[PDB]
Amino acid sequence: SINLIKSLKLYKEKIWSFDFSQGILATGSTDRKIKLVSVKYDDFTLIDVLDETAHKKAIRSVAWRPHTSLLAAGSFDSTVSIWAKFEMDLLAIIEEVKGVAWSNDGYYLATCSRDKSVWIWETDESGEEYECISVLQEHSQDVKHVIWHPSEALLASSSYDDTVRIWKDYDDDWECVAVLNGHEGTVWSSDFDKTEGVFRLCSGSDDSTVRVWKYMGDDEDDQQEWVCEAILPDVHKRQVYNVAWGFNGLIASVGADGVLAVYEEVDGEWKVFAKRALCHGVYEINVVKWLTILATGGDDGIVNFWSL
Ligand SMILES: [Ca+2]
């Protein structure tokens, strides 16, 4: 069962992105303004609004530098802003951006764009200055999403070209080490398995499916061999706009259809663990995260918080 524990209206426009660190959810909407929410299972409250006309168009992506309170925000502007901190103070502008994501060591910030590229930026302990170390142009269409592995410097990008690409460095020489071919429409997002050891990834698409991909070792050329090992059971009717793979082993998906589903892997097979229809009323749902509880963000400007 998926139970609503709290419903929080934040904007009157779409929520596109959110991210959780250190008990705080950051959110992004068609708005200039970034909103921060304190979250506990008490909880569940507004604490700050980030603006200062930094701030020109829709905030398509927000991400916390992991286990810290520094924040990055990417915009339809083509720009990406940086905040630190109560209150949050601005720090930098880096130069449509569709996604931002940090490596778990906190030193690399990846950005992706309608321009078909993925940029890798490096910073230090302080997060004050950003050096562009790679410009990664292999996708043939709009890149929708970037995410790093929980513990390796491995990056996954998802694109309107129907592929996920995996990127890895050898001494800051970042290159594409696999192209995950199989989805039949735009891949909106992906997330890595949190199981220790060799890698897997799930991805959600316009084609109404969630695929689970499995790494099958390096080839002779130091490229990675990857196959789609499963397609999850039917849920969505059907753009799948976001997926999230929790440390609990469970995958969550959300779609244009207003459904939130959870899947569990037992004895080498996936089953729907739980599902709920009309989670944002009549509204498309764009984003989902495991916080353990679920947060969903929808076209109605609400973040719903659900218990499992
Ligand atoms: Ca399907």
From Swiss-Prot:
Disulfide bonds: none
Subcellular location(s) of the protein: Cytoplasm; Nucleus
Reported effect, residue 114 to E: Impaired in cytosolic Fe/S protein assembly
CDD domains xrefs: WD40
Cross-referenced Gene3D superfamilies: YVTN repeat-like/Quinoprotein amine dehydrogenase
A biological process term (GO) from this entry: tRNA wobble uridine modification
UniProt keywords, alphabetically: Cytoplasm, Nucleus, Repeat, WD repeat
The keyword Signal is annotated on this UniProt entry: no
GO CC, alphabetical: cytoplasm; cytosol; cytosolic [4Fe-4S] assembly targeting complex; nucleus
WD repeat placement: 10-51, 54-86, 96-131, 138-177, 182-223, 235-273, 279-308
Record's function text: Essential component of the cytosolic iron-sulfur (Fe/S) protein assembly machinery. Required for the maturation of extramitochondrial Fe/S proteins.
Family the UniProt entry places it in: Belongs to the WD repeat CIA1 family.
Protein name: Cytosolic iron-sulfur protein assembly protein 1
Organism: Saccharomyces cerevisiae (strain ATCC 204508 / S288c)
